Ligand binder design. Sequence first.
Ligand SMILES: CC(C)(C)c1nnc(C(=O)[C@@H]2CCCN2)o1
Length: 313
Amino acid sequence: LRGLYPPLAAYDSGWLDTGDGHRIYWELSGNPNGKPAVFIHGGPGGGISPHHRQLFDPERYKVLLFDQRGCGRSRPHASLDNNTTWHLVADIERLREMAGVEQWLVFGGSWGSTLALAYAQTHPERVSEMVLRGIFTLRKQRLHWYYQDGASRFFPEKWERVLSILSDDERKDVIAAYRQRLTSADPQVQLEAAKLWSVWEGETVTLLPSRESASFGEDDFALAFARIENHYFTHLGFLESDDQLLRNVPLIRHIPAVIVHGRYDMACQVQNAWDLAKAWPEAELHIVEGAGHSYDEPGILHQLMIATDRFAG
Ligand SMILES: CC(C)(C)c1nnc(C(=O)[C@@H]2CCCN2)o1
């Protein structure tokens, strides 16, 4: 099984002012003359990791990685002002012009696959190839599955913790209930709910229990993670219709793509990947047996490495 390339530092980085109150952190890794690619992290509000650099051949790729508005090293931290899907799409174009890229490979998993699709369908001309993982298209059925009733049935003991702070009425609409707390004037109220929300996800993204999950409970990370995620879900991803990302697939069918999805992905059902593949025959679908959601699930990582390697010749 293929693994990550060796660790390496970015060769350049900085903050880009968007003009509307945001300074987004970005970095360039790999070969300044290599094949251009952009990495889109998940969440939303998840942030990039130095390990995301090791997903592309150091000798053949010129990788641009960045923290989306309000998370990671992008300022202001945990900000929900001017933080929507369409602003992020604009941010990607801004970063592309900065790095002087005319066209690049879009690598995105989870919410990153959601933004990757939104971006690609808005600027088809700027996308050379796509590598998608753990497909998430933001349909009501998807949000209901992970945050109302669905995954809850596979992790009943964990789901009870999420509901522990809600009254009987609030439990009717968990997303809405958490929205109130996450937007409370009381920082303590925000943090208590941010932690519960983030740990739920942290403990359900891998087939087997991981020690990595504990980091989802870290105060600063959790605060921005939960606030931003809940904000996007409260607004239905700022899409004009439930299946926007699926009905606009015709706009990108000519683009070479690889879809990798874990069979037992509990955050995003494999049905999403199947639905996408059905509308996108050209794409190559890889359903990884025995794997969960996370990009570093052995079998999922293996397919990701092979995909980027092949697209780089
Ligand atoms: C693996 C990665 C860090 C990209 C990740 N983990 N979870 C996500 C998400 O985008 C999930 C999907 C529903 C809500 N948050 O993305």
